[PDB]
Amino acid sequence: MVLSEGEWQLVLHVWAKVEADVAGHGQDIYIRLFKSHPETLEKFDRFKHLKTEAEMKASEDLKKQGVRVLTALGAILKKKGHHEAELKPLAQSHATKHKIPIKYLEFISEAIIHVLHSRHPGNFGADAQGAMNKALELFRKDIAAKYKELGYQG
Ligand code: HEM
């Protein structure tokens, strides 16, 4: 699949707003992910002990992790589809070390869309959401392909 320049513009326009507060968006996304799909928390040995949203918001380590995640995703989105190099290390670690199924990548994609919709309604109308969904679907499609090459069914 391929996004048009117009669709990429919608994606990068709202992403520019996210970048005004990377740490805050990361926390919101994780909290949404862990509350909606608790099973995903079990994959994080360093955070699986967190019991409440309050503890999650107070975790300095979780905040730092969120920044790393959004920074990596932002770098990929900014490549506008030409992300082969960026995807390699990410696919290898998540398939071989962390063992993250594609289903969980779908769950975090849902959390990202939920948070953007909540925080940036003016820059996340129907067309913008459609573009972001398309960008995330492309990301998941390419990661899934790499997973297969690496020997992980995902
Ligand atoms: C938006 C998609 C995602 C991106 C861009 C992303 C990115 C990253 C990055 C950059 C790291 C640090 C370096 C590395 O180990 O590769 C990382 C670590 C990790 N990721 Fe992800 N990730 C994503 C989704 C997920 C999901 C959905 C899960 C599981 C529910 C997950 C589980 C982990 C774990 C367990 C670690 C290691 C954390 C630690 O060091 O304690 N990731 N991720």
Curated annotation (Swiss-Prot):
Parts of the chain that traverse the membrane: none
Single biological process term from Gene Ontology: removal of superoxide radicals
InterPro entries (alphabetical): Globin, Globin-like_sf, Myoglobin
A GO CC annotation given for this chain: sarcoplasm
Heme among keywords: yes
Effect listed in the UniProt record for changing G122A: In metmyoglobin
Top-rank lineage group of the source organism: Eukaryota
Pfam name, any one: Globin
PROSITE patterns on file: GLOBIN
Location(s), subcellular: Cytoplasm, Sarcoplasm
All residue ranges annotated as the Globin domain in the record: 2-148
Protein task: Monomeric heme protein which primary function is to store oxygen and facilitate its diffusion within muscle tissues. Reversibly binds oxygen through a pentacoordinated heme iron and enables its timely and efficient release as needed during periods of heightened demand. Depending on the oxidative conditions of tissues and cells, and in addition to its ability to bind oxygen, it also has a nitrite reductase activity whereby it regulates the production of bioactive nitric oxide.
Protein name: Myoglobin
Organism: Physeter macrocephalus (Sperm whale)
